[PDB]
Amino acid sequence: PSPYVEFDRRQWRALRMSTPLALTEEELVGLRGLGEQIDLLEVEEVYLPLARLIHLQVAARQRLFAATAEFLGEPQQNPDRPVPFIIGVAGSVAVGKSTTARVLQALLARWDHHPRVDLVTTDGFLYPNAELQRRNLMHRKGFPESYNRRALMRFVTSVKSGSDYACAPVYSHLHYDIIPGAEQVVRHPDILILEGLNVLQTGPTLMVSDLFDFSLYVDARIEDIEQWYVSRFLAMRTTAFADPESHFHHYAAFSDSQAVVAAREIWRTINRPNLVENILPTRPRATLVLRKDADHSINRLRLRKL
Amino acid sequence: PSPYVEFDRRQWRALRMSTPLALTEEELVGLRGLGEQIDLLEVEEVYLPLARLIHLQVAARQRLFAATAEFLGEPQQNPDRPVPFIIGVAGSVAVGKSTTARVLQALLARWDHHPRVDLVTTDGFLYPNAELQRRNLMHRKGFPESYNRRALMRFVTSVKSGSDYACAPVYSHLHYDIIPGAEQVVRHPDILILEGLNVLQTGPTLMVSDLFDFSLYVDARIEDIEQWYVSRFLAMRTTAFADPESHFHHYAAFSDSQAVVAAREIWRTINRPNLVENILPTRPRATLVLRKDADHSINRLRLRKL
Ligand SMILES: Cc1ccccc1OCCSc1nnc([C@H](C)NC(=O)c2ccccc2C(F)(F)F)n1C
Ligand SMILES: Cc1ccccc1OCCSc1nnc([C@H](C)NC(=O)c2ccccc2C(F)(F)F)n1C
């Protein structure tokens, strides 16, 4: 067959699992907190079992650190604690990577084995617009060479080294740019989740995904992502684009049909080809592939056989 | 600062480890059975602890499988047992991958958790000579595009799927070509060691190393590999080249002085460039890098932090 265990949505719901996990209320509220109309039943029935499965791998890895150091008789060059466990999250623009990552961050943090869960986006590793322009790369923003790969690699290397201090830059969607002087600090978390278009992309030598212990790809039909993309663009007319200072402000004025035309064109010329050429070929590289239906609900989980 | 723990040989001998299991009668008579001047002291002091260290990962991976199966309530589509734990072993021609892998195969089979350990070389995935000529790639034999990467990928994927049966073709160094018809059958071993030039090579897609659970790179100063390469060439006049059915029969009759020149040429034009361009940049992808001294003794171990 294949290197994956496949469950469709029914098959997965059917599963007679070995613990009731039960979200508090409390937790259900916190999950509504980031609630871009987050489906709480799906968080509970799909993501929570999911996070438990990841938990098992984090915990196993914690014990392996311990057993290994015991064997070595705890040499001075060995770290005193397991380095952070790194989870990559990949997928198209508008597939909902980000919400997926934020859910997992909250769900994974409820175990005492690893309460400290961080979330970094590779958006912060895009070259500033100014630099991107100097390189004649603006039409290519979001494509592989539009990221400071050297810096992104230094960052993840540093976190995997168990260094207790590592900075990422920050990117503002509002301004469509890197915020000068802004940094996010990461202090040896138990889990780092690294979310981005490009986390499973491949390169000539050691690549960031070589430092991952788990990774997911959020999948859906290309037609469906297109519709979610267009719907998001029109909704931003009245949120992010409403705000002046948003350098897509001139988009807040577009009528529905004018905004559709414009959104479709950014889709067909930039995001869809990025997906076909650079993001989609990384799908088979993830530990877990979650496919979404048109209504955003998960209709298929593929997980690496253990 | 680094994703690796580093030890030199002094530091490694200076450690104080769990205890046993010392090499039986027995294993030393069997370890002589591949004794191309094999240093059994080094097998006991370096390779056997290295194999316990890998044992810990294999045992942890088997428990994680069971802990995952239990949690999913042992569904019909999940496999009945862990899939094979796959180790890659990489390095220059003549660096000692083959011997390293055979020592590892013999040692790791001693545990009851995984008595069935297999070894496959990617040599069997080179295109036959007739195909390489058709492709104009004969001068590139050993280079990445000289292998049927698709077949190599299918084979490893089939093994990591938990198939009962997976066949790899067979390469003959004597005849310098694939043996028509010949197959090695791999039957869901507990561990598969995959040895070759190219096992940690990178590609735009899902690559073979994506299916490894552990990987080793055998390293040494480029000068020293040259020296072992020549010496092996000189020594092949006696063994492989002498046999009249050898593709390189003509190299038998070479004097010492003539062999050196011819070996040095092949090294400088083919095997050194293949090392620098294609094999070396993969060194940092390995879970473990072993660097060997001029005299073949390990002088440096780098193990990925857990
Ligand atoms: C409609 C929509 C959906 C999801 C995410 C963003 C989004 O709109 C962002 C404003 S319009 C737009 N669509 N693609 C882009 C450009 C080419 N790409 C990006 O901004 C970009 C680059 C790297 C990573 C992520 C993004 C993006 F998600 F889209 F914000 N832009 C400016
Ligand atoms: C001197 C020596 C050392 C190690 C292995 C083989 C070996 O000699 C084989 C005959 S001389 C030679 N040295 N390199 C080669 C050629 C370029 N490469 C190979 O034979 C080859 C090709 C693919 C994979 C592995 C090998 C090799 F390891 F060298 F056997 N030859 C024919």
Curated annotation (Swiss-Prot), chains A, B:
Pathway: Cofactor biosynthesis; coenzyme A biosynthesis; CoA from (R)-pantothenate: step 1/5. One of its GO terms (molecular function) is pantothenate kinase activity. It is an enzyme of class 2 (transferase). One of its GO terms (biological process) is coenzyme A biosynthetic process. SUPFAM superfamilies: P-loop containing nucleoside triphosphate hydrolases. Keywords: ATP-binding, Coenzyme A biosynthesis, Cytoplasm, Kinase, Nucleotide-binding, Transferase. It catalyses: (R)-pantothenate + ATP = (R)-4'-phosphopantothenate + ADP + H(+). GO terms for cellular component: cytoplasm; plasma membrane. It is found in: Cytoplasm. The keyword Repeat does not apply. InterPro entries: P-loop_NTPase, PanK, PRK/URK. ATP binds at residues 91-98. It comes from the Bacteria. Its main location: cytoplasm. It holds the Pfam family PRK. The keyword ATP-binding applies. Was identified as a high-confidence drug target. This is Pantothenate kinase. It comes from Mycobacterium tuberculosis (strain ATCC 25618 / H37Rv).
